[PDB]
Design a protein around this ligand. Structure first.
Ligand SMILES: C=C/C=C\[C@H](C)[C@H](OC(N)=O)[C@@H](C)[C@H](O)[C@@H](C)C/C(C)=C\[C@H](C)[C@@H](O)[C@@H](C)/C=C\[C@@H](O)C[C@@H]1OC(=O)[C@H](C)[C@@H](O)[C@H]1C
Ligand SMILES: Nc1nc2c(ncn2[C@@H]2O[C@H](COP(=O)(O)OP(=O)(O)OP(=O)(O)O)[C@@H](O)[C@H]2O)c(=O)[nH]1
Ligand SMILES: Nc1nc2c(ncn2[C@@H]2O[C@H](COP(=O)(O)OP(=O)(O)O)[C@@H](O)[C@H]2O)c(=O)[nH]1
Ligand SMILES: [Ca+2]
Ligand SMILES: [Ca+2]
Ligand SMILES: [Mg+2]
Ligand SMILES: [Mg+2]
Lengths: 426, 440
């Protein structure tokens, strides 16, 4: 049993995390009360990766829910699968973090973090063989961003030999709550550069544009964005949750995907993306082409603007593996220039027989592309436009931060951008 | 949790307080005796309206509010009027002798005799909160109590509650309803003294409100009652996020993050729509597009100034009633392609939107039509410094001859405090110039 411990923090983190557990619970045949009602042994074979077994053959998510205000976790608890979570794994304060990284990381978050670590330890202690951790959060707010990265640092201190994986929602001016999001995101990215092994970068503008342009949703909601993210998270974790050879655990995945320690930020993608023709059969060739289509990717970065260091592709459903191999080989052989030539055979493909609910087949894309630098450049530009005038800084210096820490975060992310550029030219 | 305590100071603060609390009661279904049939939790709760109302075991919903005035006759009308049962007598605090339109008497001579009592009463409200968020302070610029006692109170609150948030609703003077020649002195003194102690201040220009009543409601000669009902609708729009829940509801503190780029630049411009009479509203539904467009009409601003001649550092739209994002987004798009909306270069240009679904309410015997939807825009614009400029100039005219200054010196003040206050205002005006200049 290679247990993963899941953590979800702040508003974004808990809303997406709740949807994620809804989605994979349905895949494993777990109902809202933790009872199993599936019809396939494939569903239970690796169920212990994400679920603990309670008395009465109940399955309980190995999940810790964290926030600095009670509202979103109240909603989670009142939601569809809200009763499936362990009540003691709800850890929350009352004062909130005010969309402020400093409040999350240094003041409000600091008061709460030990109680979170106590629950993390309790979950880790019962693991037969802990793989590591996966955190869901946004980078643009205060709790997920500031307290989330505080958590990651303390977890690394207590579990230095375990893998740390995040699903990190990057802010965009187009789908924005506050003007200080670029401050919060820049502060957090430096934390992630040092303390995660794998980070899936989800850009809210990409999510919005997929909903509006491709799915024809006239007025996308956070709820719509979150179902996209949930479907993607289900796809990217398929290899962890079902029998398989490739990327079957967090460490083997990292060894395959991360050739240089700092360059561990992935662009995920999902297919099919279909507007409400929705009954039309999908072919492997069509899955493959859409999976690699920039329009199906979620970092708002143009892959043709860079090069792939490594790629993992996961196909789900009953389909010809012969055709999958053929189609995957075709994509690499016909656009070979976008794959760095100094990492031979850097595209790995996995197939899982169980498709997502309500689909005959689907495909999920994980790319380690140097084009991700565009995302960090955007954040850096927005950061500097304000910081050059020290605008909105008083929210942070009021929590004890000084300007030098912002200067260092800025330099750190520009270093990261430079590091991507050198391998794009290599 | 998240309690807010309101403090109403002097005649303007108290009478505006009357109008707001009456309106809140109507919005939440609270009777004048404080009973609220719809509230099924007796004697407590953590509902949204509990941010502004505590509850007794006898089912009374009591404003989290203190009324303070240095003479008794305005607050006596609260003590003896329609909503008298609403307030515990200890929440209504009066002295015998007012500040005679003199900041020095409000802050020093008369104010010092009652400030400890007022703080004790506030502490009693604070002690009943489980997560006090901060204070909302209502007062005029021009009166002796509104200016001088408010300053003293804000200073003492900083000491006793530290950096707990303090927001103001400040009544900026207009000649049509002003009662003292020295109101510009009082305004500059209190603005200087309170500046470091306030996190955010919503100025309400009596002349702007006076004009709106005359023009939009066809009121020949607006009374304070007319002015105050309008002001309470605007105050209610601003506090609605605190008092109601909802999926699309955005907390005031979240708008505040965007509205205050530097501590001293903390004076948002409020614009409210629709202000329309019953006779004009009948059979004439005003859409989301129409009320949104009206926010960029200067005639509808709470402070007279011209944003078309300034730069924006933030734009927030607070909707209430029958409003969905689809319609808001379309309305904003139209506006961006037709309006004088220029932002400074160091600020993002997106409009921040909040929607509260509870529809607007009106008071019986009022001038405003009951509408299905309304909006309050809160913008941070360099144009608001026009208001300071006008006041600072009246100050300069009188102070050059030291007119009326002996009234202040006689109560213990020094000329040094006047020039210090006026220099702070000059620096503020300069701060507003500087934030508008492009980055190099
Ligand atoms: C908006 C499109 C909705 C449905 C489409 C017709 C498609 O459905 C089928 N059956 O082909 C799906 C796969 C879309 O292509 C997806 C982009 C929809 C998607 C994930 C998110 C939307 C943004 C969001 O509004 C959401 C509430 C709408 C529909 C979801 O209930 C669809 C199901 O969600 C899943 O998690 C599984 C993958 C699978 O069971 C899927 C059928
Ligand atoms: N909008 C509004 N303005 C008012 C009201 N009452 C007074 N004002 C304005 O407030 C200023 C005068 O200050 P007041 O609040 O009356 O004075 P005070 O705070 O009671 O101070 P003293 O009487 O000097 O102790 C003038 O600009 C008036 O026009 C009111 O009910 N509504
Ligand atoms: N995709 C998605 N993004 C969200 C959601 N809620 C907030 N955000 C984004 O997250 C950032 C705000 O952080 P949030 O999680 O609300 O703050 P926190 O509660 O302090 O962590 C902004 O970039 C928002 O656009 C959500 O439910 N889904
Ligand atoms: Ca604390
Ligand atoms: Ca109650
Ligand atoms: Mg939020
Ligand atoms: Mg008076």
């Amino acid at each position: 049993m290679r247990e993963i411990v899941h953590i979800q923090a702040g508003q974004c983190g808990n809303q997406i995390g709740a949807k994620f557990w809804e989605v994979i619970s349905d895949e494993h045949g777990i109902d809202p009360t933790g009872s199993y009602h599936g019809d396939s042994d494939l569903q239970l074979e690796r169920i212990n990766v994400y679920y603990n077994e309670a008395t009465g053959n109940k399955y309980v998510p190995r999940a810790i829910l964290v926030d600095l205000e009670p509202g979103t976790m109240d909603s989670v608890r009142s939601g569809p699968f809200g009763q499936i979570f362990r009540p003691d794994n709800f850890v929350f304060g009352q004062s909130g973090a005010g969309n402020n990284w400093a409040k999350g990381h240094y003041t409000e978050g600091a008061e709460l973090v030990d109680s979170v670590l106590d629950v993390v330890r309790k979950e880790s202690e019962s693991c037969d063989c802990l793989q590591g951790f996966q955190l869901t959060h946004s980078l643009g707010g205060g709790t997920g961003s500031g307290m989330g990265t505080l958590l990651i640092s303390k977890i690394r201190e207590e579990y230095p030999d375990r893998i740390m994986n995040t699903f990190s929602v990057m802010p965009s001016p187009k789908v924005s709550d506050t003007v200080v999001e670029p401050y919060n995101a820049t502060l957090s990215v430096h934390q992630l550069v040092e303390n995660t092994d794998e980070t899936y970068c989800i850009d809210n503008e990409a999510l919005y544009d997929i909903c509006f342009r491709t799915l024809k949703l006239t007025t996308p909601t956070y709820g719509d964005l979150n179902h996209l993210v949930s479907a993607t998270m289900s796809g990217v974790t398929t290899c962890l949750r079902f029998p398989g050879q490739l990327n079957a655990d967090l460490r083997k995945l990292a060894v395959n995907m991360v050739p240089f320690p700092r360059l561990h930020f992935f662009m995920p993608g999902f297919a099919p993306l279909t507007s409400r023709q929705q009954y039309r059969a999908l072919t492997v060739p069509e899955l493959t082409q859409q999976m690699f289509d920039s329009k199906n990717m979620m970092a708002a970065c143009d892959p043709r603007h860079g090069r792939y260091l490594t790629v993992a592709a996961i196909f789900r459903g009953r389909m010809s593996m012969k055709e999958v191999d053929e189609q995957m080989l075709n994509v690499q052989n016909k656009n070979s220039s976008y794959f760095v030539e100094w990492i031979p055979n850097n595209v790995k493909t996995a197939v899982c027989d169980i498709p997502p609910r309500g689909l005959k087949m689907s495909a999920t894309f994980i790319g380690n592309s140097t084009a991700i630098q565009e995302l960090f450049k955007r954040i850096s530009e927005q950061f500097t436009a304000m910081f050059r005038r020290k605008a909105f800084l008083h929210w942070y210096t009021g929590e004890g931060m000084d300007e030098m820490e912002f200067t260092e975060a800025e330099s750190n992310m520009n270093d990261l951008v430079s590091e991507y550029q050198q391998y794009q030219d290599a | 949790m998240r309690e807010c305590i309101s403090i109403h100071v002097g005649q303007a603060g108290v009478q505006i307080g009357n109008a707001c609390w009456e309106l809140y009661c109507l919005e939440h279904g609270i009777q004048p005796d404080g009973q609220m049939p719809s509230d099924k939790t007796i004697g407590g709760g953590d509902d949204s309206f509990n941010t502004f109302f505590s509850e007794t075991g006898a089912g009374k919903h009591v404003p989290r509010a203190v009324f303070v005035d240095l003479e008794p006759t305005v607050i006596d009308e609260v003590r003896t009027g329609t909503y008298r049962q609403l307030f515990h007598p200890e929440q209504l605090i009066t002295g015998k002798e007012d500040a005679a339109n003199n900041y020095a008497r409000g802050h020093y001579t008369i104010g010092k005799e009652i400030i400890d009592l007022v703080l004790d009463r506030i502490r009693k409200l604070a002690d009943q909160c489980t997560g006090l968020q901060g204070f909302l302070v209502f007062h005029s610029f021009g009166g002796g109590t509104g200016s001088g006692f408010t300053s003293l109170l804000m200073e003492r609150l900083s000491v006793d509650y530290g950096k707990k948030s303090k927001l103001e609703f400040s009544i900026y003077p207009a000649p049509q309803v002003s009662t003292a020649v020295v109101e510009p002195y009082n305004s500059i003194l209190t603005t200087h003294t309170t500046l470091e102690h306030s996190d955010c201040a919503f100025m309400v220009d009596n002349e702007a409100i006076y004009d709106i009543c005359r023009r939009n409601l066809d009121i020949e000669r607006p009374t304070y009652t007319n002015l105050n009902r309008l002001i309470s609708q605007i105050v209610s729009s601003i506090t609605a996020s605190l008092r109601f829940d909802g999926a699309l509801n955005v907390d005031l503190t979240e708008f505040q993050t965007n509205l205050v780029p530097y501590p001293r630049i903390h004076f948002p411009l409020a614009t409210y729509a629709p202000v329309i009479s019953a006779e004009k509203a009948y059979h004439e539904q005003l859409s989301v597009a129409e009320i949104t467009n009206a926010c960029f009409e200067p005639a509808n601003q709470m402070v007279k100034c011209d944003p078309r001649h300034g730069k924006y550092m933030a734009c927030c739209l607070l909707y209430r009633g029958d409003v969905v994002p689809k319609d808001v987004n379309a309305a904003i798009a139209t506006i961006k392609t037709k309006r004088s909306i220029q932002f400074v270069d160091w600020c993002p240009t997106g409009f921040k939107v909040g929607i509260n679904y509870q529809p607007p309410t009106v008071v019986p015997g009022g001038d405003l039509a009951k509408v299905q939807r309304a909006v309050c825009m809160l913008s941070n614009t360099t144009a608001i410094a026009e208001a300071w400029a006008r006041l600072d100039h009246k100050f300069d005219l009188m102070y050059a001859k030291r007119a009326f200054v002996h009234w202040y010196v006689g109560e213990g003040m020094e000329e040094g405090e006047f020039s210090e206050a006026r220099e702070d205002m000059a620096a503020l005006e300069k701060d507003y110039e500087e934030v508008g200049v492009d980055s190099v």
